[PDB]
Design a protein around this ligand. Structure first.
Ligand SMILES: [Zn+2]
Ligand SMILES: [Zn+2]
Ligand SMILES: [Zn+2]
Ligand SMILES: [Zn+2]
Lengths: 245, 243, 245, 243
């Protein structure tokens, strides 16, 4: 009676090397894990070492099928009816400069979550995409130039069928004033400077353009789109978010 | 054409004066200030959030947060919006043997929210405590591993719950609470007290949540605890949400 | 013999409310402190609670005279021949918008250090100043627009006579493509957009212009100037620093 | 007209493969890559630092760092420059009773530096350990407060000192070292061992520094330890520099 069920208990911020397979290829990265299970009112404690045992023994490449298997195996190993695994890591993608064709990596921040509830599995994801934002107000009121800055666009979603990390990346980067590259030659820098100027967007415009795409995707049951613009003229950020439905 | 749930400014740093039941203090806040944006409206008016903060010189407390949130949604011409303010919060404590006084620091957020002329508020408090392991003590012939823990309480009520109240709910339940200033007899007392009161992370979250369930001002809450286990390089963690 | 002196021992990241007085006025802020003393080979340990005792008992406003007194009192209280107090905090200054005249605060990050060595006192400081940087290459090669971004300029210095926090701020902000304001009306935004465009500067130009000023100041015995530009076109930073002499 | 000590790129994130004495692993690095800039030269050539990393596919180790730093100062047409690479580093450990194996994570930086055709290298390793308080144990009738500690070793040598070597120097000296995976008999062993080997932060830094002084490959070093005291909300800290 005095006793209460605990929504989630286990371990948090275990750092662990992982290999990840997505549609575009396989890559090695380093993750932080939070691994937890439901604890019924009657049980005193969970078994904390079994969460680490699980990661040490499962050597398969991570993908959405493997995260499912892993979460199902965890709840079984932990003797629980419910649990979550959240895995956060940097994610690299090969990019090509818009004029030179010179290739370089860009880095994104990703989290993947698997959740079991009484035999039912659900999965969600989050991706932070760094883009260039350029202010339409600045350009319009100014006889020359326009302020611009890096922005972090964060998409969180839950879907029934799998949605690829790269697909979330493309939905955002398609919409940005201009996207980022690690390696830019002189013509590419001329290209990005001009495109961003040509395509100014408020933080409001950015969240709306991405949200439109996500609403259209039949896989997506709910989402949040945030955008944060590190305003180059202020020392605080412009911020917006849309949650759906 | 889509409405935007919230749009405005994030992580504006700003000095504030804060009034609570035990007194007034000066601290430094981060603010996030946002309003609802209707489907066909192009943008909000970003400079007005800063203007509002620059103009209002009054001490912060729950009544002044309400007033600032009202005035914001008015000034921005919106039907809804939210103000969240985060800051370090200091409280004077008394060492348990010497009685020598010293401050402790806690992390607090308060949030006010207007939706179509109705107001709601909520708060969050991170209280650092000592945790000590019952399995370690029971299995070992001497000693018990122990570590700092960060206990985070988020709650929503209608009547005001004081920051100090949330702190007390938690410190009362910890294996032992923290102090900045401890003499040798104080160190002895805290060492023994934690060792006499071992708690798993499970125990800590159940013990705090029971106290909050008993407080009938509280509509809903989350209690989390993260224990920086001194024998691992990762943490034990738990949370309860209610209802 | 087996025993070794310890350069510095004490406490680190004590968070503590402070009141600070500089040339422009007095303000309340929150600091992190690191307070340490020298430990001779022969002594087993220092007295850790006395560092907190010291902060709890000294209720005077902080300024360079008070940091001196505080460091001298610490080494005496700790029974040591040498020690350091480092105090880090956000620092607010009142600013005025360049067209409207509308006033707002801006926030800077500051550290002040006091050091005793056998009766001799020395003090140093560091200030991070967030500014706008605008790329000359971008503007010159582009038919319109120029990429720009927040930059953090960090000045560290040691001096014999006191150098005010605001003076370090002015040395940097005087040199920037354009400086930041919290509150900007439409004409002010037109003003800052244009000024930054009119005054493009590489990270190299920025460190050089600030360093020139610091070399000229007779108070300053040594310094480091760093600048980091959060390139709005990349996901890494452009960075430079000058150390002198 | 002023020369600039170092100019280039900072916190480029980049996946790397790392080879050490115990094996090869894949990790993710932050890089800072800079060159000296002569007084009358206007700017460096920023895109070339990224090109250099994109082109060189070789496994990282001390010989490859030297080679990358040589090639950089060549490609940038500078007389001096520095490459620093920071990453999490994993090592497989054996629990002290069960022998069950599990990884532990450490934070590493390696730095290479060219000055007028001469090369130097240096390294930094943060090793997390358990610390346990001798005063707490001595004064208390039972128990002893203990906590995670972050021990950071920075060193410069000419002959290569392995990352695992620095880790061993430190773990050997801690009240007890950390493991990710511990069974009940392992938890008992580590609890007792720390309690049998209490050390102040002073003790830890002297004990490590003595080991490093004895390693005649080492030209200079700094040992710091920060102990996240489980009875306070602040840390004990010490450092030694040598010579
Ligand atoms: Zn703008
Ligand atoms: Zn335990
Ligand atoms: Zn540029
Ligand atoms: Zn102690």
């Amino acid at each position: 009676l005095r006793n209460l069920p605990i929504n989630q208990v286990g371990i948090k911020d275990l750092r662990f090397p992982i290999t990840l397979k997505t549609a575009e290829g396989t890559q090695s990265t380093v993750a932080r894990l939070t691994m937890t299970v439901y604890l019924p009112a009657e049980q005193k404690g969970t078994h904390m070492s079994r969460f680490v045992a699980l990661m040490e023994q499962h050597t398969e490449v991570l993908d959405f099928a493997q995260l499912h298997r892993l979460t199902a195996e965890m709840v079984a190993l932990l003797d629980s009816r419910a649990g979550k695994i959240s895995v956060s890591f940097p994610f690299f993608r090969k990019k090509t400069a818009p004029v030179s064709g010179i290739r370089s990596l860009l880095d994104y921040d990703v989290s993947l979550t698997g959740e079991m509830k009484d035999g039912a599995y659900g999965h969600s994801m989050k991706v932070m995409i760094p883009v260039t934002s350029l202010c339409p107000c600045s350009k319009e009121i100014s006889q020359y130039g326009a302020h611009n800055q890096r922005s972090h666009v964060t998409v969180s979603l839950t879907s029934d069928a799998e949605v690829g990390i790269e697909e979330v990346i493309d939905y955002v980067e398609t919409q940005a004033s201009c996207q980022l590259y690690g390696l830019l030659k002189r013509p590419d820098e001329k290209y990005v400077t001009e495109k961003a100027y040509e395509n100014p967007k408020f933080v409001e415009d950015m969240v709306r353009d991405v949200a439109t795409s996500l609403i259209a995707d039949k896989r997506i049951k709910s989402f949040v789109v945030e955008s944060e613009n590190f305003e180059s003229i202020h020392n605080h950020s412009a911020y917006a978010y849309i949650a759906y439905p």
